[PDB]
Design a protein around this nucleic acid. Structure first.
Lengths: 120, 135, 108, 48, 176, 63
RNA sequence: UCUGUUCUCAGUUCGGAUCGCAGUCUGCAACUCGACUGCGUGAAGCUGGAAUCGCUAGUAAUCGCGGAUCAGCAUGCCGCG
RNA sequence: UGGUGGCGAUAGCGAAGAGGUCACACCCGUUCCCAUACCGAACACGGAAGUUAAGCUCUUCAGCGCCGAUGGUAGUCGGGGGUUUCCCCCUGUGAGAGUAGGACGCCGCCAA
RNA sequence: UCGCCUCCUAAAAGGUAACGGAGGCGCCCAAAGGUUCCCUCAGAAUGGUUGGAAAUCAUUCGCAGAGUGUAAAGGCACAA
């Protein structure tokens, strides 16, 4: 039983490290990502009251993507959270990676936000 | 001849004594103990003289059970010098003793011989002194 | 190579086989006479079948570490027997008996 | 052993800058990129 | 590949049904093999690192990593700087290729090998071999090779106790 | 997997003196084997040659 | 000594001492303490400072051969080529 | 059930027992993105054979650790005495592991 | 001994003397700065080489014993 370190512990460590200099306030919220190996989640968080303005996930009941976690599906769920902002217009947000490096599905999510015009 | 083999700072303040001892208020390790009533300084030579008195009178025992160790160094200037120009040289070591301090503990020796040994050695210390037995 | 240790390459086999432990010139002569290598052979030119059969005949003979452990076993047997001659090996003095004062200088 | 260096700008010739450097560790002539207030931009600066 | 299929097919189910594990996939498995040089001649000859960079690149298909002395020792004349030793780590299929090359040619090519002791573990189930010569395969340039020094092999498994690792390496084929 | 610094290896084959074939990857393509596991008697159950060499002098003077 | 092949300058096919195994002979008996043989092992030694020895018509140097004390034991000694 | 915040560890470290069809995570392969001075161990890319033992969530314990009052003392602001390298009395204040006990969780918002 | 820094004396804010008790400074760094990204040491136990209490490795424990350019004090492993 050689000790393999868990992914989530190191991810919470580096997520606290990136959280230490940014936190989504009122009218300046935080866009947070989870990149679990079957589904992709995005949230808009206000820090001072602990509320969620909008959120989006690949396990949603319409306009599903077959690959369920491809970067194409990440661009799709970026489009969905863009329409969630379109009902609830904030039109600016600070991106918060999970410590997930800015190359992957998080990069496709960010690029979907840029293409839809969500100001980072 | 009781010596701390290493000390951080070889010169330190004389200090002030007031109030009872923090610990050592009861004889716990032997069965007859001796207590201080008045607070003063007790030196290496006084500890050694009391131990020689006890051991040489009893000529037997479990052990002697000295309960204090001198850590405080005291300093003296050399004789006949104009006073000042720096603190003097360390001369010896002192165990600080507050009232209610057990000084020596005795186990395994009977009643009157223990009484005689503790009287004989308490006469060799500068402080007023009382016998005590373990509850 | 042959006994797990290397061989010289550009000399004759009846001499080159004496390099490996526990086997010698007369022994190499008498094994290679019946092996039929004509006593002048470079190892750069040979055949695998003759290499295999010399491999098994030097495998059957007492070559590689077994002579070392055999003489070690006999000499340690002599140590726990003691019996003078073991004391001579332990002290390093000459054993077969000689004038121990005059030369005695191959040992110690 | 550190020495004082004035740093003249490349094209204009106004120093505006001093620094400390070790001639044992850096025997070459140092090249920096520093703002020149006469030239109104960051310009390469020469060790004199 | 081949040892993956072999490992699964006649090591995993036999021992898991022998010792009645609660899940199949908690079977012990060899995790990696790490090779150490520890060559302390860099004070005397500092240029001897690329020496056996060549034949550790001959052993494994990827380059070794030069180790780093974490402090300075005066009695060994080791200042800080001038790094000592060389390490490499093998995992995946390259580790299984190393076990094939270690079993097939290397231990028979060792000409004094006897059955190793049972108590050669580190106490938890992770094994260390020491091999005193560079003689693994005959294209090691033994004829004009420079040094005759040794090699440290540490095989590391996920077996928590010693008995599981012992029976696993008997199923691999280590002679004891 | 940095290309250009790892030495290339091919799918190599392993040929024994007994004609055994085995597969590996190495710098070379085909490797000679002088002695192999199933040829060495130590692997093959009990030892064969040192079994004959394992005798001791059991005070055999009687001849 | 005279004709052929090899080694090609090396601690080597030099050199043979110590060591284990197995023997032959002599003798009541080869451990203390004999000689010799077959093996294997192969050591120091790459012509040696201060100084120092012998040698003038077979002389030095080499190569052997006998003999004497003695059951057996020469590199000692005597003699011969 | 997951994601995500606040509360001093009354939230911890451990000892036991369940769970996975949805999720989470193990696993599988490096074809290009990327990467390890060594590598798919991590960082990535894209799939889902089987797998709850671990990560995770629940039920229990005072083993360890943590929190912790009432009178009790030591110290002391302010008065007043004494044989004054220090003691004693007053209207007040009031310590610290030690015991009363608490506790191996309490509140939000989105997706089931 | 004469200037500057740090601790105690310094009497729970700040300040406070003595020829009182301990040290240090008259520099170093073109990275030993700035930013972006990623972790975790000191020590101990056990296995294996010339490897030796102690070169290098692998595993386990390890809230800080180690680091933090240099003296000390205050801070820091959500890194300083």
């Amino acid at each position: 039983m050689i000790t393999k370190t868990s992914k989530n512990a190191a991810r919470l460590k580096r997520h606290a490290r990136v959280r230490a200099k940014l936190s989504g306030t009122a009218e300046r919220p935080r866009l947070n990502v989870f990149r679990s190996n079957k589904h992709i989640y995005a949230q808009i968080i206000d820090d001072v009251n602990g509320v969620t303005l909008a959120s989006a996930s690949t396990l949603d009941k319409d306009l599903n993507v077959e690959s369920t976690g491809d970067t194409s599906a990440a661009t799709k769920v970026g489009e969905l959270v863009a329409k969630r902002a379109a009902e609830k217009g904030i039109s600016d947000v600070v991106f918060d990676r999970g410590g997930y490096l800015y190359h992957g599905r998080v990069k496709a999510l960010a690029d979907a936000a840029r293409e839809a015009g969500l100001k980072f | 001849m009781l010596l701390p083999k290493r000390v951080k700072y070889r010169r330190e303040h004389r200090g002030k004594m007031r109030g009872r001892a923090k610990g050592g208020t009861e004889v716990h390790f032997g069965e007859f103990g001796i207590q201080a009533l008045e607070a003063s300084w007790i030196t290496n030579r006084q500890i050694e003289a009391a131990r020689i008195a006890m051991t040489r009178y009893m000529k037997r025992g479990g052990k002697v059970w000295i309960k204090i160790f001198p850590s405080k160094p005291y300093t003296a200037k050399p004789l006949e010098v104009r006073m000042g120009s720096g603190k003097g040289a360390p001369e010896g070591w002192v165990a600080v003793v507050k009232p209610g301090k057990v000084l020596f503990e005795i186990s395994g020796v009977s009643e009157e011989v223990a009484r005689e040994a503790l009287r004989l050695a308490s006469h060799k210390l500068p402080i007023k002194t009382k016998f005590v037995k373990r509850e | 190579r042959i006994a797990g240790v290397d061989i010289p390459r550009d000399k004759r086999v009846v001499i080159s086989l004496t390099y490996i432990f526990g086997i010698g010139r007369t022994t190499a002569q008498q094994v290679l006479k019946e092996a039929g290598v004509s006593e002048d052979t470079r190892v750069r030119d040979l055949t695998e079948e003759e290499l295999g059969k010399i491999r098994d005949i030097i495998d059957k003979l007492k070559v590689e570490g077994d002579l070392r452990r055999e003489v070690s076993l006999n000499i340690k047997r002599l140590i726990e027997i003691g019996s003078y001659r073991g004391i001579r090996h332990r002290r390093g003095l000459p054993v077969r008996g000689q004038n121990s004062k005059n030369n005695a200088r191959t040992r110690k | 052993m550190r020495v004082n260096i004035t740093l003249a700008c490349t094209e204009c010739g106004e120093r505006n800058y001093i620094s400390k450097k070790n001639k044992r560790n850096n025997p070459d002539r140092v090249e920096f990129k520093k703002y020149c207030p006469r030239d109104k931009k960051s310009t390469l600066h020469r060790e004199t | 590949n081949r040892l993956k299929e072999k490992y699964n097919k006649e090591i995993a189910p036999a021992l898991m049904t022998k010792f009645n594990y609660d899940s199949v996939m908690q079977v012990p498995k060899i995790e990696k093999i790490v090779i150490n040089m520890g060559v302390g001649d860099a004070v005397q000859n500092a240029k001897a690192i690329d020496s056996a960079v060549e034949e550790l690149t001959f052993i494994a298909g990827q380059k070794p990593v030069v180790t780093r002395a974490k402090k300075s020792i005066a009695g060994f004349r080791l200042r800080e700087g001038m790094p000592i030793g060389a390490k490499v780590t093998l995992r995946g299929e390259r580790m299984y290729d190393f076990l094939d090359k270690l079993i097939s040619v290397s231990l028979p090519r060792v000409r004094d090998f006897r059955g190793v002791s049972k108590k050669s573990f580190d106490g938890r189930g992770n094994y260390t071999l020491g091999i005193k010569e560079q003689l693994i395969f005959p294209e090691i340039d033994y004829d004009k090779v420079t040094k005759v020094r040794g090699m440290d092999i540490v095989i590391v498994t996920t077996a928590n106790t010693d008995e599981e690792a012992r029976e696993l390496l008997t199923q691999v084929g280590m002679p004891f | 997997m940095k290309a250009g610094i790892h030495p290339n290896f091919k799918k190599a084959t392993v040929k024994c003196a007994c004609g055994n074939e085995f597969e590996t990857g190495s710098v070379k393509e085909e490797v000679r084997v002088e002695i192999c596991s199933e040829c060495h008697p130590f692997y093959t159950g009990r030892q064969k040659f040192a079994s004959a060499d394992g005798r001791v002098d059991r005070f055999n003077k009687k001849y």
